[PDB]
Design a protein around this ligand. Structure first.
Ligand SMILES: NC(=O)c1ccc[n+]([C@@H]2O[C@H](COP(=O)([O-])OP(=O)(O)OC[C@H]3O[C@@H](n4cnc5c(N)ncnc54)[C@H](OP(=O)(O)O)[C@@H]3O)[C@@H](O)[C@H]2O)c1
Length: 194
């Protein structure tokens, strides 16, 4: 480990590798950091830049730092067919217990301003995720307890009418015995919902 806000790392790690340096260097930092990092490829290797400030020419790097293939890249350069394979390979590993989702700072999308402030102040933890408003869907089941009531049944009619609900379970102590129950079922089932 070493501090990211100084350049001590550059001569701290070459000293820890005994001058061999490393074999690959993934950068996000700009400015003087770019050159200070190439110093950790004395024996050459890969050096690859995510940051889009201070992009460099692969050839004047290969010259000034023999055996260093430099490529600044963006995830879009992979192409959609490759992403699928890569994502397949990753999901294989998440399911094997090798990779774990990062720490999450979660917010409701309607509260997105504050979320971007967290991010722009570097005060988020790991990954920020925004979660959409509540919604009923035609996929999956919806439970309406007391769905033989003044409105509980009226809600059921309306969920299927304008919320697209296609699967319902109405519940109550009486259950089917409730009056208007088998009548409300036939009414909703005719509306296309199980
Ligand atoms: N309607 C209004 O103007 C109004 C106003 C304010 C608040 N609310 C609230 O809105 C909700 C619906 O009220 P509502 O006006 O439609 O009265 P409701 O017609 O009597 O419907 C209430 C439903 O809840 C069921 N129920 C009672 N106890 C239950 C239990 N332990 N477990 C499962 N189901 C139970 C009843 O079925 P079973 O007896 O067969 O179990 C009944 O079908 C209530 O929670 C009420 O507090 C309604």
């Amino acid at each position: 480990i070493a501090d990211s806000r100084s350049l001590d790392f550059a001569g701290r790690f070459l000293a820890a590798t005994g001058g061999r340096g490393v074999d690959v260097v993934l950068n996000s930092l700009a400015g003087d950091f770019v050159d200070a990092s190439l110093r950790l490829l004395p024996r050459g290797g890969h050096f690859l830049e995510l940051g889009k400030a201070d992009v460099r020419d692969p050839d004047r790097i290969a010259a000034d730092h023999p055996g260093v293939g430099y490529r600044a890249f963006d995830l879009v350069e992979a192409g959609p067919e490759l992403v699928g394979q890569l994502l397949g390979e990753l999901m294989e590993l998440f399911a094997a217990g090798v990779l774990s989702p990062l720490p999450l700072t979660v917010r409701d999308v309607r509260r997105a301003r504050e979320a971007f402030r967290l991010i722009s102040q570097a005060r988020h933890v790991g990954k920020v995720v925004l979660t959409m408003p509540p919604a009923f869907g035609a996929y999956g089941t919806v439970l309406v307890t007391g769905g033989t009531g003044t409105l509980g049944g009226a809600v059921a009619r309306h969920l299927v009418a304008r919320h697209g609900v296609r699967h319902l379970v109405l519940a109550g102590r009486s259950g089917p015995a409730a009056d208007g129950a088998s009548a409300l079922v036939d009414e909703l089932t005719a509306s296309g919902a199980s």
